[PDB]
Ligand binder design. Structure first.
Ligand code: HEM
Length: 79
């Protein structure tokens, strides 16, 4: 089974709501990670409420197995 969310995810851009992102068709609630993001949370927050792809494309440091499995710990469902 799968918890399915619509892209309209876009409302989850703060702690009060939860900070969510997508990667592929997967949805992640990354609220508890953000302050630990390398260089700080503000860069990560550029992607809040939407897909990581347009941002991660410029930052190939995310293209590591450990990063992908780290993100997977925050999965909540799918689009
Ligand atoms: C939920 C989203 C994100 C997660 C889970 C994530 C996770 C990570 C992790 C684990 C690293 C360190 C990798 C390593 O050095 O081995 C990293 C580094 C970095 N991330 Fe992200 N990232 C996210 C979003 C973003 C976004 C949206 C941007 C850009 C707009 C970004 C820019 C960077 C940069 C610049 C670094 C390098 C920092 C440094 O070494 O100074 N990240 N990220």
């Amino acid at each position: 089974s799968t918890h399915i969310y619509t892209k309209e995810v876009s409302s989850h851009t703060s702690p009060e709501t939860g900070i969510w992102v997508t990667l592929g068709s997967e949805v992640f609630d990354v609220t508890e990670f953000v302050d630990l993001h390398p260089g700080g949370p503000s860069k990560l927050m550029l992607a809040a409420g939407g897909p990581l792809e347009p941002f991660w494309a410029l930052y190939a440091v995310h293209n590591q197995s450990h990063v992908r499995e780290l993100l997977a710990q925050y999965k909540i469902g799918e689009l």
